[PDB]
A paper describes a structure:
The entire chain, except for the first seven residues, was well resolved in the electron density map. Dimer-dimer contacts are stabilized by a branched hydrogen-bonding network involving R49, S52, and N53 of one monomer and F63, T61, and R55 of the opposing monomer. HLp also harbors a conserved RD-clamp—an intramolecular salt bridge between R55 and D62—that stabilizes loop l2, a feature shared with both HMfB and HBb. The central α2 helix is one turn shorter than in the archaeal histone HMfB, while the C-terminal α3 helix is truncated and forms a single helical turn composed of the final four residues—similar to what is observed in the bacterial dimeric histone HBb from B. bacteriovorus.
Molecular dynamics simulations, DNA-binding assays, and heterologous expression in Escherichia coli, where HLp reorganizes the nucleoid, support a role in bacterial chromatin organization.
Author numbering:
A (entry chain A), B (entry chain B), C (entry chain A), D (entry chain B): 8 to 63
Write the structure that this text describes.
Amino acid sequence: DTLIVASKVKAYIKSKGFMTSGDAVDGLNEKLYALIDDALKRTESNKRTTVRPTDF
Amino acid sequence: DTLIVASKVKAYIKSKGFMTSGDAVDGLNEKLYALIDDALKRTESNKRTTVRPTDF
Amino acid sequence: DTLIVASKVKAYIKSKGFMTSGDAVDGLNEKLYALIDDALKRTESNKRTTVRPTDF
Amino acid sequence: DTLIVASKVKAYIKSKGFMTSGDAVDGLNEKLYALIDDALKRTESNKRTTVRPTDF
């Protein structure tokens, strides 16, 4: 499932004077899943069941 | 601006047995902006203005 | 100060069939300082004074 | 193999007011190998075999 709002990612990239390839947002979606999986490991390592912003 | 679908991020975290704090999605959003800023630097370093999935 | 063992980073890169530019290890040193600074924020966020491997 | 100077990493962490767990440097080493593996993928994606600082 896509967790990313493609239009908002493309908008931010455009605001900096860059373009986005057709498959760029797919790559970022993969990185986002990795960031979350890493955060869950940190949450568990601190004996918590609630993910906090500082866990990412 | 939010780059993610909060409901889908919270759902994925719940599917792994975890809850999400009120500001956890905001933390992930901040990390995503940092990942994009890093990617723009990599795009420019390869004499491109089109961001590719491999730049993230 | 350099926190990286340049010879061991270059060795690992060589083992994968790649070469290392003259200024590559400097870039990785900068990323390492960022990783540590992020980890210290996570340590403090969990009311600890001792950095753990899971904080990185 | 360790890619970092443990004494200098522990010193930097101490300078910021923190202690380092016995296996904390091992955790950072693991993250560094991941950063290099990601960089090799970026190098190859730009039709290069020489890793640049901007690939990390």
